[PDB]
């Protein structure tokens, strides 16, 4: 159930507005296809009717904000949870920080051999305050939800 602040809904409503081109508050297959053709996609009509249908709670044939949002919050919510759970696997001593030895050790046990250099590269494309570690905040920014 969408608890959400005023900011992520400002994001979700923007997300919606870009789909609802003529602004009548609902997204049609024709409006969905346009967006998707725009982003380089190649869908069929049967495909679009299929997307509009799994989210069309009231079966009227178009997606409205309420319907759009229920679904976007469920997604966003499943994602935050799997990123939260992933953090738990790397941070094996619970300190709230994933260190190189942590990441290295885990990668090894995960079916992957990495060098000292490679690990530092990973724990450095995420590290925003040069301390040699990735905390949950830094981690969540790397794994932008999904
Ligand atoms: Ca519309
Ligand atoms: Ca609907
Ligand atoms: Ca740790
Ligand atoms: Ca850090």
CATH homologous superfamily heading: EF-hand
Number of domains: 1
Helix content: 55-70%
Radius of gyration: 20 Å
In one word, what is the shape? elongated
Encode the helix/strand succession as letters: HEHHEHEHHEH
Assign the structural class, choosing from mainly alpha, mainly beta, alpha/beta, alpha+beta, or little secondary structure. Answer: mainly alpha
Give the CATH class: Mainly Alpha
| CATH fold-level topology | Recoverin, domain 1
Largest sheet: 2 strands, antiparallel
Number of strands: 4
Task: Give the CATH architecture.
Answer: Orthogonal Bundle
Strand content: 5-15%
Strand order of the largest sheet: 1-2
Distance between the termini: 18 Å
The ligands found in this model are: calcium ion
The number of distinct helices, counting runs of at least 4 residues, comes to 7
């Amino acid at each position: 159930a969408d608890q959400l602040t005023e900011e992520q809904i400002a994001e979700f409503k923007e997300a919606f507005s870009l789909f609802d081109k003529d602004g009548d508050g609902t997204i049609t297959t024709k409006e969905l296809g346009t967006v998707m053709r725009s982003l380089g996609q190649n869908p069929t009509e049967a495909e679009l009717q299929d997307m509009i249908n799994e989210v069309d709670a009231d079966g009227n044939g178009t997606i409205d904000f309420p319907e759009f949002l229920t679904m976007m919050a469920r997604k966003m919510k499943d994602s935050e949870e799997e990123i939260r759970e992933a953090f738990r696997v790397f941070d094996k001593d619970g300190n709230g920080f994933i260190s190189a030895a942590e990441l290295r050790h885990v990668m090894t046990n995960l079916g992957e051999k990495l060098t000292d250099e490679e690990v530092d590269e990973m724990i450095r494309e995420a590290d925003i305050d040069g301390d040699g570690q990735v905390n949950y905040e830094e981690f969540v920014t790397m794994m932008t939800s999904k």
